[PDB]
Design a protein around this ligand. Structure first.
Ligand SMILES: [Zn+2]
Lengths: 258, 91
């Protein structure tokens, strides 16, 4: 109910959470009872007309490992995307802070895979899958966030480290551009918040992933766990796995460890 | 203006005293592009647009990175002009 729209008069701003990729995020109460995160979407970057109509698709997605979108405040500038609050902040700082056991690291990959498998079934694209976008709740569960927003609006920018060769070269987005982005995310998880291709610049990285240079096996990644994330990086996007295939490769290693 | 205490180049240049030597971008071209050192890692803020930048790589131009991320900045435009910004943003 409410037409996916929230009355901004029922939103109480309690504390600032920080600047996200697509706007500044605040913490508060919706109707004085529900803990929410209000994302104020940045002026000038967004068309607003393109978002207002197409957002209805994004809101209808419902999954355990997907940040619950509560509603949007489109009636003003900037628009506010009200979602559930994720106590442990983002995955990127969370790994960097911590030390987990390796079965906890694999489990995190499994939560993101289960959510990507869901979006894959609904023909939806995340486009920007990385540890900075995944959020962690008060229970250490990872939930995917910042999906699709990338499709509503430089020489060499940092997302080059997360993008496959067809994205660097022709800017071709598909379920295979997100399979690759997931393998890179598995690498960030096993490397504990490390930067992908840390020894290379934004521009060097492009003419290296293009040549066939891949991420080295993280110290905590077993030689069979590295096989799963290496599956994700096929030079030819067609010979890459599916979120259902990957989920079954991950669940195989959980039994072959415990 | 966000940090009024850093509107002068020489004020910004003092914050780069604790700048790591390892960072390959110069404190001179950072202070010239409106940036000042915040005190942690390589985090710099524009005194004007409050825009924060970090993870500086070799071959970076603070003015180009200023226009790549904060192009509507009322200082970047007053110093380098819209014709510089449009060439960077529209790349
Ligand atoms: Zn600025």
């Amino acid at each position: 109910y409410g037409s996916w729209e929230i009355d901004p008069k029922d939103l109480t701003f309690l504390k600032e959470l920080g600047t996200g990729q697509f706007g500044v995020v605040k913490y508060g109460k919706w109707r004085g009872q529900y803990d929410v995160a209000i994302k104020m979407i940045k002026e000038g970057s967004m068309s607003e007309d393109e978002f207002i109509e197409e957002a209805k698709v994004m809101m209808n997605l419902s999954h355990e490992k997907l940040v619950q979108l509560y509603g949007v405040c489109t009636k003003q500038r900037p628009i506010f995307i009200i979602t559930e609050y994720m106590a442990n902040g983002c995955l990127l700082n969370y790994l960097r802070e911590m030390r987990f056991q390796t079965q906890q690291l694999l489990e995190m990959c499994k939560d993101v895979c289960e959510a990507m498998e869901y979006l894959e079934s609904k023909q939806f694209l995340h486009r920007d899958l990385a540890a900075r976008n995944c959020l962690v709740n008060d229970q250490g569960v990872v939930k995917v966030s910042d999906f699709g927003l990338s499709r509503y609006v430089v020489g060499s920018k940092f997302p080059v480290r997360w993008s496959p060769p067809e994205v660097l070269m022709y800017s071709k987005f598909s379920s295979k551009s997100d399979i690759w982005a997931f393998g890179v995310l598995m690498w960030e998880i096993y490397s504990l918040g490390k930067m992908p291709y840390e020894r290379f610049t934004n521009s060097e990285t492009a003419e290296h992933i293009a040549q066939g240079l891949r991420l080295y096996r993280p110290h905590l990644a077993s030689e069979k766990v590295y096989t799963i994330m290496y599956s994700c990086w096929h030079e030819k996007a067609d010979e890459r796995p599916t979120f259902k295939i990957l989920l079954s490769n991950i669940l195989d290693v959980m039994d072959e460890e415990s | 203006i966000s940090n009024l205490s850093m509107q002068t180049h020489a004020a910004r240049m003092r914050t780069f005293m604790y700048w790591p030597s390892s960072v390959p971008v110069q404190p001179e071209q950072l202070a010239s592009a409106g940036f000042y050192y915040v005190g942690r890692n390589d985090d710099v803020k524009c005194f004007c647009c409050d825009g924060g930048l970090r993870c500086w790589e070799s071959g970076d131009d603070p003015w180009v990175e200023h226009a790549k991320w904060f192009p509507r900045c009322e200082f970047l435009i007053r110093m380098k002009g819209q014709e510089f910004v449009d060439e960077i943003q529209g790349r």
